[PDB]
């Protein structure tokens, strides 16, 4: 029994917003985020409470600013530790187009702005390499895919122009048939794959989803008999397309799955995204949602919609057990 962790993050104004002289309608204090409706200024502002509240509207010179490193060391390290404990984990970024989902998950591979995914990978390998018990050995395999109009593309295998089939293994759940799963032995190798994968994405409103998966295997060697008990945790880091057809089936279905789970049949199979993430939503997985928010008055409805779906997500609870 573990509830879905939910964080909200508000970014700086973008060019569109500055050009319309947008005012900031988002306020944050502690774990409370309040949104002002520019349309009805005298109506009571709506407040929401979340596990994490990242005020990233200003800049690093600000004392209360939430940087990439701070967002990661917070929710990121939390989930990585769960993976070390043997739990499957998932972190997905959700929000309006341009709200800051990719910046939070991937960031920029330059000076100081790496997002959750690169940092977690670096942290994962750093920890593995600091192991001092020779009875422990590890394996790290990675997969990276894109879901566009219900079709799946293998980002680590651009050579291939066929969309992979999402299937249901009779006993082990959903999987992408013939999706590349590469073993990596260093942060540098996994980062090259990440960079290669990011470049083959399409290709400026995204309407594809990106799923970066890591299969982290921990092998404990028992000295006396020679059996090696395995510990496997799947780490799924998701960067969703923004919210505003076959192009939008996945996002709408996710909304319904999230609402249904919060309400407690579920249309998991109604879309490739919810099908593949079935166990992370209501299964054996420690899951977190990072809701990206625009700070601008002009996006009140979209932002309010995001806050509401993030509020429901908070109510989801999943039965978790360590994979030993």
Ligand X SMILES: Nc1ncnc2c1ncn2[C@@H]1O[C@H](COP(=O)(O)OP(=O)(O)NP(=O)(O)O)[C@@H](O)[C@H]1O
Per the annotation, where are the binding residues? 65, 98-103, 206
* Catalytic option among 102, 180, 271, 294: 102
Q: How far is the CB of 270 from Mg ion (least distance, A)?
A: 23
Residue showing tokens 């020779």: 134
Query: CA dist 199 to 11, 88, 161, 196, Å?
Result: 24, 27, 15, 5
Q: Residue 154 in contact with residue 180, Cβ under 8 Å?
A: yes
Q: Which of 52, 87, 103, 309 is catalytic?
A: 103
The listed partner (ligand X, Mg ion, none) that binds 100, CB under 5 to 8 Å by sort, is: ligand X
| Nearest-approach distance from CB 290 to ligand X, in angstroms | 11
Give one word for 53, left, alpha or beta, with left for phi > 0 and alpha for psi -120 to 50: beta
Q: Which residue has the tokens 């390290």?
A: 77
Shortest reach from residue 97's CB to Mg ion, in Å: 8
Which member of 53, 242, 282, 300 is catalytic? 242
CB of 44 to ligand X, least distance (A): 28
Q: Residue from 11, 153, 209, 312 that binds ligand X (CB under 6 A)?
A: 11
CB nearer ligand X, residue 25 or residue 140: 25
Q: Write out the binding residues for ligand X, residues 71-110 only, by CB under 6 A.
A: 97-103
98 binds, among Mg ion, ligand X, none (CB under 5 to 8 A by kind): ligand X
3-class secondary-structure state, position 17 = helix
Residue 197 partner contact from ligand X, Mg ion, none using kind-dependent CB cut-offs of 5 to 8 Å: none
| Catalytic position from the list 76, 95, 100, 115 | 100
Could you say whether residue 205 binds ligand X (CB under 6 A)? yes
Cβ atoms of 231 and 86 closer than 8 Å = yes
Find the catalytic residue in 95, 98, 107, 115: 98
For 182, residues 6+ apart whose C-beta sits below 8 A from its C-beta are 141, 142, 143, 156, 193
CA distance 254 to 169: 22
Q: Is 239 a catalytic residue?
A: yes
In DSSP notation, 224-257 reads SS--EEEEEEEEEEEEPPPB---SSHHHHHHHHH
CA 303 to chain centre: 18
**Which segments are annotated as binding site for ATP?**
100-103, 206
Q: What is the torsion angle, in degrees rounded to the nearest 10, for the CA atoms of residue 269, residue 312, residue 71 and residue 139? A: -30
Annotated active-site residue 139? The verdict is no
Question: Site for Mg ion (CB under 5 A): which residue of 33, 68, 102, 243?
Answer: 102
User: Residue from 292, 296, 313, 320 that binds ligand X (CB under 6 A)?
Assistant: 292
209: contact with ligand X by CB under 6 A: no
Alpha-carbon distance 38 to 303, whole Å? 12
Binding interface with Mg ion (CB under 5 A): 101-102, 206
- Catalytic positions are 98, 100-103, 239, 242
Binding interface with ligand X (CB under 6 A): 11-12, 14, 56, 97-103, 205-206, 241-242, 292
């Amino acid at each position: 029994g573990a509830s879905v962790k939910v964080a909200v993050r508000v970014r700086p104004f973008n060019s569109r917003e500055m050009s319309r002289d947008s005012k900031c309608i988002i306020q944050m204090s502690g774990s409370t985020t309040t949104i002002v409706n520019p349309k009805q200024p005298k109506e009571t502002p709506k407040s929401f409470s979340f596990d994490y509240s990242y005020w990233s509207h200003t800049s690093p010179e600000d004392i209360n600013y939430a940087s990439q490193k701070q967002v990661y060391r917070d929710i990121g390290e939390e989930m990585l530790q769960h993976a070390f404990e043997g739990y499957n984990v998932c972190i997905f970024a959700y929000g309006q187009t341009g709200a800051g989902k990719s910046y939070t998950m991937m960031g920029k591979q330059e000076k100081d702005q790496q997002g959750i995914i690169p940092q977690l990978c670096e942290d994962l390998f750093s920890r593995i390499n600091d192991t001092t018990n020779d009875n422990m050995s590890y394996s790290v395999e990675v997969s990276y895919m894109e879901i566009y109009c219900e079709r799946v593309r293998d980002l680590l295998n651009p050579k291939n122009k066929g969309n992979l089939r999402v299937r249901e293994h009779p006993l082990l759940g959903p999987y992408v048939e013939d999706l590349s799963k590469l073993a990596v032995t260093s942060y540098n190798d996994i980062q090259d794959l990440m960079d290669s994968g990011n470049k083959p994405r399409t290709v400026t409103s995204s309407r594809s989803h990106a799923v970066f998966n890591i299969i982290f295997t921990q092998k404990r060697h028992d000295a006396e008999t020679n059996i090696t008990t395995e510990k496997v945790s799947k780490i799924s880091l998701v960067d969703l397309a923004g919210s505003e057809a076959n192009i939008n089936k996945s996002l709408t279905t996710l909304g319904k799955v999230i609402s249904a789970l919060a309400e407690m049949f579920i249309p998991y199979r109604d879309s490739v995204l919810t099908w593949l993430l079935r166990e992370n939503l209501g299964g054996n997985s420690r899951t977190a949602m990072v809701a990206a928010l625009s700070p601008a008055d002009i996006n009140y409805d979209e932002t309010l919609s995001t806050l509401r779906y993030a509020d429901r997500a908070k109510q989801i609870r999943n039965t978790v057990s360590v994979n030993h």
